[PDB]
Write a sequence for this structure.
């Protein structure tokens, strides 16, 4: 079946930038759009935006316009999300979700925990 | 324009109710339960774009003829103006069949129940077109003979009502193990043979093909069978899967053929009217 | 931006019982709604999409209903594994939004 694999937990300093990896297998990578979701601890899901492998076209929530940038590797069938100027507020688990024609997500990545500490 | 955004999906991820042709591998609309999104998709490319437009174009043109012919300027050219009803019945059938067809194809991806409702309409529409075609045709071929004409008409309507009722089954029954819907469909095609040959025997073989244009008119029956045979076979998609996803699929050729065949019926039928004025009876 | 309001914040029931979770949208989302179940420390899993369509492999106890601005998720014959957080989302308009979520406890 379809599998979405994400990178390991990340621990970083404020103002740092991080890259999240979504590895897609069991389906044609270019066939469907990829979405990114952020969940702050003990909080509800937030939609960062979507990315089109076919058009390399992406949409971002107004909240995450400067914070996140989506890139993709078609040969590796891998999707990436870049977070810059990390802040305290960004400490959340990040997911990549694949849509099926419409933005409903049948498949999800395990998620990546991005921990930002002044420490 | 940022509302109801969607992308084409391969055949494999489709739900069973949208899986009706395994030779169309890609370009399928994802299921969207929105009429706005379904009607907006007409101006977009997918497996059903061709099917929408062919019968959407066929509807407008047949609509013109119905109204244009209905407002005949030469009401004086028509004798006795009673004839308009006969032509009108044909136009309703053609127009309704055509309107139902483009509607079903447009709303096909909405939901299983919506797809089901419109599917029944599409089947009913075909029966209506067949019913419609016979009234003008039977009236003029048997223009001189009233008793044979009334009798042929009753059969078609009984078989026709039976066809719509069997297909929609809103009132009662189905889905069933029974293949009876087919029996009624069989009635429509078969009912046509007794009248057509009857016309030939009474008017003579030579006179009927040359003047009646029945033999020339023979092409229409061939065309319908070609379309029916072609769609079930799913040619050329069967031979080249994935090469006919958006264009030249079996369904669109069949859709095109219905318009061509209904039009041929009209041209051939119109000639029959001229034949009738020349000879009162013989 | 469409705002999704989920009700209630949390709820509890026993095995075999029926529970209903309601979602209300700020604007009409035209049946473009999905329901997700999230176990603690795990990624969410889709239950229902397109308002009333059950996702493949999902237990029959889960069902979706509603149109326009109001949608409901109903769980019949509640099971021990059904505990978790449930979310609703609208994919009709951008930005896509999620409900606050509902926490479920089984007794
Ligand atoms: Zn059709």
């Amino acid at each position: 079946e379809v599998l979405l694999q994400q990178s390991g937990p990340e621990l970083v300093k404020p103002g740092a930038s991080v890259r999240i990896t979504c590895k897609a297998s069991g389906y044609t990578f270019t066939d469907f759009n990829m979405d990114w979701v952020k969940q702050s601890p003990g909080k509800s899901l937030e939609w960062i935006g979507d990315f089109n492998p076919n058009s390399g076209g992406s949409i971002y929530n107004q909240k995450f316009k400067d914070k996140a940038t989506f890139t993709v590797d078609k040969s590796s069938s891998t999707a990436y999300m870049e977070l810059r100027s990390l802040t305290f507020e960004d400490t959340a688990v990040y997911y990549c979700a694949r849509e099926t024609g419409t933005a409903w997500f049948a498949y999800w990545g395990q998620g990546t925990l991005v921990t930002v500490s002044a420490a | 324009g940022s509302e109801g955004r969607w992308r084409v999906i391969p055949y494999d991820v489709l739900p069973d109710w949208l899986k009706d042709n395994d030779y169309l591998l890609h370009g399928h609309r994802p299921p969207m339960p929105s009429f706005r999104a379904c009607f907006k998709s007409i101006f977009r490319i997918h497996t059903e774009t061709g099917n929408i437009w062919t019968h959407l174009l066929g509807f407008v043109l047949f609509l013109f003829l119905g109204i244009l012919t209905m407002l005949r300027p030469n009401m004086y050219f028509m004798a006795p103006l009673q004839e308009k009803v006969v032509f009108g019945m044909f136009f309703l059938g053609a127009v309704l069949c055509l309107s139902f067809s483009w509607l079903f194809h447009t709303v096909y991806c909405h939901s299983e129940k919506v797809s089901r409702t419109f599917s029944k309409l599409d089947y009913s529409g075909i029966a209506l077109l067949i019913m419609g075609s016979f009234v003008p045709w039977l009236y003029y071929s048997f223009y001189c003979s009233p008793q044979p004409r009334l009798i042929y008409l009753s059969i078609v309507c009984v078989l026709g009502i039976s066809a719509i009722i069997v297909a929609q089954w809103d009132r009662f029954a189905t889905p069933k193990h029974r293949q009876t819907r087919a029996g009624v469909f069989l009635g429509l095609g078969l009912s046509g043979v007794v009248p057509t040959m009857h016309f030939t025997i009474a008017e003579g073989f030579v006179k009927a093909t040359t003047v009646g244009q029945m033999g020339w008119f023979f092409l229409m029956a061939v065309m319908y069978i070609t379309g029916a045979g072609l769609y079930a076979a799913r040619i050329p998609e069967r031979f080249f899967p994935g090469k006919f996803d958006i264009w030249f699929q079996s369904h669109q050729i069949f859709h095109v053929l219905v318009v061509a065949a209904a039009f041929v019926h009209f041209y051939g039928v119109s000639n029959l009217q001229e034949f009738r004025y020349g000879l009162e009876g013989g | 931006d469409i705002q999704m309001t989920q009700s209630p914040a949390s709820l509890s029931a026993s095995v075999g019982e029926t529970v209903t979770i309601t979602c209300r949208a700020s604007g009409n989302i035209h049946n473009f709604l999905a329901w997700y179940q999230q176990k603690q420390g795990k990624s969410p899993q889709v239950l229902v999409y397109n308002a009333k369509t059950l996702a493949d492999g999902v237990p029959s106890r889960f069902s979706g209903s509603g149109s326009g601005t109001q949608y409901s998720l109903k769980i019949n014959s509640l099971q021990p594994e059904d505990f978790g957080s449930y979310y609703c989302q609208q994919f009709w308009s951008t930005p896509y939004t999620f409900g606050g979520g509902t926490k479920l406890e089984i007794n």
User: Anything to note?
Assistant: The two ends of chain A are 41 Å apart (CA to CA). The longest strand of chain A covers residues 92-100. Chain A has one domain: 1-119. DSSP finds no helices and eleven strands in chain A.
